[PDB]
Amino acid sequence: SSTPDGTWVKCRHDCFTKYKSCQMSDSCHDEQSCHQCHVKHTDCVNTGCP
């Protein structure tokens, strides 16, 4: 029972904004296409903050 980190989460948020930005992109036309944004976030997070 402890917090994960504080800077590592900044990555989650960093890629999150990039993800939200992806959802704001017109690439979010399909659910899968928007899912890719989430998946990119997942990979972004996996790489930026595994």
Defining key terms:
monomer, toxin, monomeric, U-actitoxin-Aeq5a
Structural overview:
It is found in: Secreted; Nematocyst. Belongs to the Acrorhagin I family. With 50 residues, this protein is an all-alpha fold. It has helices at 8-24, 31-48. The relative contact order is 0.19.
Rg result = 12 Å
Instruction: Please tally the β strands and state the result.
Output: 0
Q: Kindly, what is the distance between the CA atoms of the first and last residues, rounded to a whole number of angstroms?
A: 19 Å
- Derived from helix and strand composition plus strand pairing, the structural class reads mainly alpha
Which shape, going by the Cα principal axes? elongated
Q: What is the total number of structural domains? A: 1
Fraction in beta strands: under 5%
Query: What is the H/E order?
Result: HH
Largest sheet: none
Number of helices: 2
The helix content is over 70%
Protein name: U-actitoxin-Aeq5a
GO molecular function, one term: metal ion binding
Organism: Actinia equina (Beadlet anemone)
Family: Belongs to the Acrorhagin I family.
Produce a short descriptive summary.
With 50 residues, the protein is mainly α.
List the helices and strands and how they pair.
Blueprint: H1 8-24, H2 31-48
Helix pairs in contact: 1-2
